[PDB]
Amino acid sequence: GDVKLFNRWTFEDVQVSDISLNDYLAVTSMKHYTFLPHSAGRYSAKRFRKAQCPIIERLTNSLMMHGRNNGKKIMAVRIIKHTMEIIHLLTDANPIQIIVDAIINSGPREDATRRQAVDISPLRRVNQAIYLLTTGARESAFRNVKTIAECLADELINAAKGSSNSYAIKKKDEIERVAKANR
Amino acid sequence: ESLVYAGVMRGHNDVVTAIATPIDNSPFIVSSSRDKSLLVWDLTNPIQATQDSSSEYGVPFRRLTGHGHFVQDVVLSSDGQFALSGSWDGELRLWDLSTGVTTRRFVGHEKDVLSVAFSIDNRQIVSASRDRTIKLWNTLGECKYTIGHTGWVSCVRFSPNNFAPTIVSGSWDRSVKVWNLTNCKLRCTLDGHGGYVSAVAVSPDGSLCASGGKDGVTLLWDLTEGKRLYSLDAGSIINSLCFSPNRYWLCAATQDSIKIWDLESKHIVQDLRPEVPVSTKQMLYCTCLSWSADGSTLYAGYTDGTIRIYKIS
Amino acid sequence: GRVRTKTVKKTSRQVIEKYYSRMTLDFHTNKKVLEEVSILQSKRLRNKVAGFTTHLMRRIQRGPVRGISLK
Amino acid sequence: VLTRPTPGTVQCFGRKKTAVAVAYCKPGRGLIKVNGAPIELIRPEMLRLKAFEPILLAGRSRFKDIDMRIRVRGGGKTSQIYSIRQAIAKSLVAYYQKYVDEAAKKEVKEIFGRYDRTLLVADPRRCEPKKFGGRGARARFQKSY
Amino acid sequence: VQHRIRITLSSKSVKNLEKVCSDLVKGAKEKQLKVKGPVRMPTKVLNITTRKSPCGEGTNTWDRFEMRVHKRVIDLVSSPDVVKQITSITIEPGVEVEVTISD
Amino acid sequence: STARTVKDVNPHEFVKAYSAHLKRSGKMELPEWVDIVKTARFKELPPSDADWYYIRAASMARKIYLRQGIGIGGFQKIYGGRQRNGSRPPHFCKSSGAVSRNILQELQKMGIIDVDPKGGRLITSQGRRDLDQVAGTVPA
Amino acid sequence: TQISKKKKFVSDGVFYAELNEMLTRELAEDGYSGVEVRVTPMRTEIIIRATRTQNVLGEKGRRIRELTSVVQKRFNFPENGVELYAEKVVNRGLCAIAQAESLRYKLLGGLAVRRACYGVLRFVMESGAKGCEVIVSGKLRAQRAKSMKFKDGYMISSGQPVNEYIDAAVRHVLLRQGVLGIKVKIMLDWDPKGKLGPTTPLPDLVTIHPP
RNA sequence: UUCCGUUAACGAACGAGACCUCAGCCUGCUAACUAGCUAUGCGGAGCCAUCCCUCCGCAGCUAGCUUCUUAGAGGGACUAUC
Ligand SMILES: [Mg+2]
Ligand SMILES: [Mg+2]
Ligand SMILES: [Mg+2]
Ligand SMILES: [Mg+2]
Ligand SMILES: [Mg+2]
Known part of the structure; x- marks a missing residue:
């Protein structure tokens, strides 16, 4: 327990349930434990190197949108910290487990290309989960008194439970449905 | 009468090029590598091999990182506190082993230095380089006579006898030359090799001189008479040659194995070979053989940077 | 794409053709002798010739090649 | 030959982009400062843990016998912190290599490497020059037809 | 000797300037004069960027011309006589030697 | 604890403590144009803090403590920032020189900062002592 | 009197570019190949490379002295501070x-x-x-x-x-x-x-190298 | 049109690459009063005095040195090794 996120949250007790989505969320291995969701890492030179990037950092990078927020990663890390504290307040559990549960219960597993229904790979699954989570939080925050950190916390908490009150889960459902209608 | 795998030490990440041993049986060794560094090994508490897959016959004690390119030959001082490391960057450095810093750089070689050798009394320094010249130095970094060969002088060993200080020289011109240090002239060109002479060695008594290289055949001549003698045949290209201090042996680091030959029966007494497990390191051979001062342990530097110790049992 | 051009490949086979004896299996030793039996106008081109020379010098040990290497 | 040398001084630098941080280490009582101020005050504050990582991992006990004075110039407010990080790590590694035995260096270097190679090896990434025909290195002016 | 001499050397080429500097510092070290140098100043990069087209048609393509000025400073302590006796060898074209006497 | 100089304390807390110190000392005379002026022309409102004069005095006192030779133009550049030009791109702008000069003269009329012959302003021994003895009171 | 090191190297370049132009237009039918400016301490020696090195010299070197004086006055050299040679x-x-x-x-x-x-x-x-x-x-x-x-x-x-x-x-x-x-x-x-x-x-x- | 390989084509040449410049590495080299570092001395402040320690300023072409800065020379990668 030497490395803790923000020196306030433990990594050892994080259980990544899905065996499929296990090598594409970098939380369990000790090599993927970091103090800060900020690395300035070169996780884009190769095709499958962003999978070995810490998952909190992958969540943080999707907050640097839109263009008005591009490159502002310290503010994104601040949002992540203030979101992880609200998560611990409203769930009394480890915020990293809530985050991995939300990313697991948000990635669509089947999609319709071309309209044949195709199955999503684990990497695109986690990418879509993160994209939907941060997109829903950002759209909740836009033109709203609620802070982006509070909207992110609410979205993550509702996605961890599996409730259809989270924009990501509603959208996952639509996506997979259109791949059931067009099977 | 025989050697057993005492243990292995890993302190270099690339080909170990030379291993010098203290003359006074001090419990350390100095090893160079193509990682541009020297390494002093703590050999006070040697963990003998247990086949438990761990341990280290020795601990790396002090690193010496001053050279700019591959270190190729290091010889220790008679006192044991000083080391002289020739490097491919073209200079020689004199290191205080206690502190770990360079005490004198030896400039004057234009190409990669290949072999260094202290005199019997640590007064003169000789170096061999790719510039086809043999350079004599002082302990003050001043270049004396600059001895000739027609190729890379790969090795130059100081005859351990004092009636007439002599430096041998093996070259990529396929020759072995005996230079009289007193006049810095030449005495006898010992020829007969069919390939580059990548290694020479002189027996402690200062009579027999060994020579090997590309030909794969170790020709042992006599320095005093300059006449060829028995023509011991090794398996592959010989990288290093060394005489046992007290057991009348001649070990040759070849690309197949380490072969020790008793010069009395002219027969192969043993052939040590690494216990590597796969065809990964397709070529993993020994580059530098080194007998300890007592003559009880043989240190072998390999191409992976590991050092394997074989004690007499 | 790391495909060697003719100048690198041709020089490699001509160097092995003449100086097979004074050519080792190590890049760093081969790039030193390549400076003694040739005049190349670039370090980058000298490295590519010695790296492909070492490459060929190991395939010769395998046994089949389309050079000559009388031996 | 097999005795520890008298503890002395090392000077090591780290780099990120155009920021350079140089750490001067001397035998002391464990003081670590950057441009005179204590490191426990470095800013930005939410990147403070990034600069603390080498100390938090090597342990504050490995820094007792050294005083760390770090000068950092260039770059920005992130690259300077990432440079101070690498300067601290490389300074501790070099200090353990010249005055505290190679084995302890090897252990601390292995810890640093398993956490992050950036702690020891500088990232070689630099800004790409701008090309005419666009406002950026790759971006081109908007095309009409 | 007595006074302090600063020889400034400038050029557009590195090899000519460096070999002139080597000649100067070699002459200084033969006459047993202490020499501080050569000291290489930061290189000046004179840059001109202009539209290659002599008119306003085509892809607006830009050629970037550069002139690099290299400055070398040599600091001897001596008398003017030895200084002009040293800086009288064949100074190669393009090299601007300039001698200034300090206290 | 104590024995902490200025380069030991968090600047945000040191400036707040020293502004209170200056306001308590009662040796600062405020201009008539304290509630009117703006610190810069790119500013669109006067400072919202009533004690902004003492806060800026503490800020410049600390800056003169850490560096010697800052002039009025240097302090205009230090407290200058980004100007928004309406429909035009933003650029850097400088601060007001009257405010900097008046506060520095008020700080000369306390023996905190003097003026050096080499140009600008230096910190006096009394000013160094004052800032260092206030830095020890700052809670860590 | 103090001229920058930048202004000076640009001035030498412009002077070279102008001299060669006027020599190209003047010594056209003399085979003018190029000019090699050489600023020696006493004078700025100017070497002219041509093919008809008797047409640029002129009768008893009249033309070459005319060019030497024109360069001196036009470019503002000190008198006897410029000497135009003519090589082959x-x-x-x-x-x-x-x-x-x-x-x-x-x-x-x-x-x-x-x-x-x-x-x-x-x-x-x-x-x-x-x-x-x-x-x-x-x-x-x-x-x-x-x-x-x-x-x-x-x-x-x-x-x-x-x-x-x-x-x-x-x-x-x-x-x-x-x-x-x-x-x-x-x-x-x-x-x-x-x-x-x-x-x-x-x-x-x-x-x-052949073996 | 980069090679391999097939083959009435073989062997070349231009172009491509090579080359050049800038950037990335060098605790190796060369050298800095128009660049710094470190130490020393003095002075200022703190702590409370001094001392020590900490942060500063000034000085020393007899204080050393070149890590940081500069700029020359070189080295370094070749897909080298698996
Ligand atoms: Mg909002
Ligand atoms: Mg003004
Ligand atoms: Mg804008
Ligand atoms: Mg090209
Ligand atoms: Mg340097």
């Missing part, structure tokens, strides 16, 4: 400006272009260039303009070795029907002594 271009065949002007006068006279361009090629190749190329563009025979290339030998076009191995010139002929263009590109051979051509061999050229 060693190999006229290996100079693209000399051949460009020779082909200029070989066409101002009236000789057929297809016979003078091949003559220039001939002379260059006998001189020793590794390759030569001549381009003639303009209203050669008809009203529509066309470009006739005259290439023989080996000629590189790309990379850095071009600005070491390619000696090139561009000259106009002011004819009755309009302007005729002449591009002469002479490719030099690698000279170990660095007189006839470059001293650096071409980068791709590899030499293996």
Whole structure:
């Protein structure tokens, strides 16, 4: 327990349930434990190197949108910290487990290309989960008194439970449905 | 009468090029590598091999990182506190082993230095380089006579006898030359090799001189008479040659194995070979053989940077 | 794409053709002798010739090649 | 030959982009400062843990016998912190290599490497020059037809 | 000797300037004069960027011309006589030697 | 604890403590144009803090403590920032020189900062002592 | 009086570019190849490279002194602070400006272009260039303009070795029907002594010592 | 049109790449009063005095040195090893 996120949250007790989505969320291995969701890492030179990037950092990078927020990663890390504290307040559990549960219960597993229904790979699954989570939080925050950190916390908490009150889960459902209608 | 795998030490990440041993049986060794560094090994508490897959016959004690390119030959001082490391960057450095810093750089070689050798009394320094010249130095970094060969002088060993200080020289011109240090002239060109002479060695008594290289055949001549003698045949290209201090042996680091030959029966007494497990390191051979001062342990530097110790049992 | 051009490949086979004896299996030793039996106008081109020379010098040990290497 | 040398001084630098941080280490009582101020005050504050990582991992006990004075110039407010990080790590590694035995260096270097190679090896990434025909290195002016 | 001499050397080429500097510092070290140098100043990069087209048609393509000025400073302590006796060898074209006497 | 100089304390807390110190000392005379002026022309409102004069005095006192030779133009550049030009791109702008000069003269009329012959302003021994003895009171 | 080191090197460059222009226009029919400015401490010696080094000198050196005085007054040198010499271009065949002007006068006279361009090629190749190329563009025979290339030998076009191995010139002929263009590109051979051509061999050229 | 390989084609040449410049590495080299570092001395402040320690300023072409800065020379990668 030497490395803790923000020196306030433990990594050892994080259980990544899905065996499929296990090598594409970098939380369990000790090599993927970091103090800060900020690395300035070169996780884009190769095709499958962003999978070995810490998952909190992958969540943080999707907050640097839109263009008005591009490159502002310290503010994104601040949002992540203030979101992880609200998560611990409203769930009394480890915020990293809530985050991995939300990313697991948000990635669509089947999609319709071309309209044949195709199955999503684990990497695109986690990418879509993160994209939907941060997109829903950002759209909740836009033109709203609620802070982006509070909207992110609410979205993550509702996605961890599996409730259809989270924009990501509603959208996952639509996506997979259109791949059931067009099977 | 025989050697057993005492243990292995890993302190270099690339080909170990030379291993010098203290003359006074001090419990350390100095090893160079193509990682541009020297390494002093703590050999006070040697963990003998247990086949438990761990341990280290020795601990790396002090690193010496001053050279700019591959270190190729290091010889220790008679006192044991000083080391002289020739490097491919073209200079020689004199290191205080206690502190770990360079005490004198030896400039004057234009190409990669290949072999260094202290005199019997640590007064003169000789170096061999790719510039086809043999350079004599002082302990003050001043270049004396600059001895000739027609190729890379790969090795130059100081005859351990004092009636007439002599430096041998093996070259990529396929020759072995005996230079009289007193006049810095030449005495006898010992020829007969069919390939580059990548290694020479002189027996402690200062009579027999060994020579090997590309030909794969170790020709042992006599320095005093300059006449060829028995023509011991090794398996592959010989990288290093060394005489046992007290057991009348001649070990040759070849690309197949380490072969020790008793010069009395002219027969192969043993052939040590690494216990590597796969065809990964397709070529993993020994580059530098080194007998300890007592003559009880043989240190072998390999191409992976590991050092394997074989004690007499 | 790391495909060697003719100048690198041709020089490699001509160097092995003449100086097979004074050519080792190590890049760093081969790039030193390549400076003694040739005049190349670039370090980058000298490295590519010695790296492909070492490459060929190991395939010769395998046994089949389309050079000559009388031996 | 097999005795520890008298503890002395090392000077090591780290780099990120155009920021350079140089750490001067001397035998002391464990003081670590950057441009005179204590490191426990470095800013930005939410990147403070990034600069603390080498100390938090090597342990504050490995820094007792050294005083760390770090000068950092260039770059920005992130690259300077990432440079101070690498300067601290490389300074501790070099200090353990010249005055505290190679084995302890090897252990601390292995810890640093398993956490992050950036702690020891500088990232070689630099800004790409701008090309005419666009406002950026790759971006081109908007095309009409 | 007595006074302090600063020889400034400038050029557009590195090899000519460096070999002139080597000649100067070699002459200084033969006459047993202490020499501080050569000291290489930061290189000046004179840059001109202009539209290659002599008119306003085509892809607006830009050629970037550069002139690099290299400055070398040599600091001897001596008398003017030895200084002009040293800086009288064949100074190669393009090299601007300039001698200034300090206290 | 104590024995902490200025380069030991968090600047945000040191400036707040020293502004209170200056306001308590009662040796600062405020201009008539304290509630009117703006610190810069790119500013669109006067400072919202009533004690902004003492806060800026503490800020410049600390800056003169850490560096010697800052002039009025240097302090205009230090407290200058980004100007928004309406429909035009933003650029850097400088601060007001009257405010900097008046506060520095008020700080000369306390023996905190003097003026050096080499140009600008230096910190006096009394000013160094004052800032260092206030830095020890700052809670860590 | 104090001039920057920037302003000074730009001024030397502009002075060189202007001198060569006025010498090109003045010593046109003297075979002017180029000028080598050499600022010695006493005077700024100026060496002129030409083919008719008796036409630029003039009767008892009248023309050369006239040019020396014109340069002194126009460029504002100190009196006796400039001295214009006149040397011999060693190999006229290996100079693209000399051949460009020779082909200029070989066409101002009236000789057929297809016979003078091949003559220039001939002379260059006998001189020793590794390759030569001549381009003639303009209203050669008809009203529509066309470009006739005259290439023989080996000629590189790309990379850095071009600005070491390619000696090139561009000259106009002011004819009755309009302007005729002449591009002469002479490719030099690698000279170990660095007189006839470059001293650096071409980068791709590899030499293996015979065993 | 980069090679391999097939083959009435073989062997070349231009072009491509090579080349050149800038950037990335060098605790190796060369050298800095128009660049710094470190130490020393003095002075200022703190702590409370001094001392020590900490943060500063000034000085020393007899204080050393070149890590940081500069700029020359070189080295370094070759897909080298698996
Ligand atoms: Mg909002
Ligand atoms: Mg003004
Ligand atoms: Mg804007
Ligand atoms: Mg090209
Ligand atoms: Mg340096």
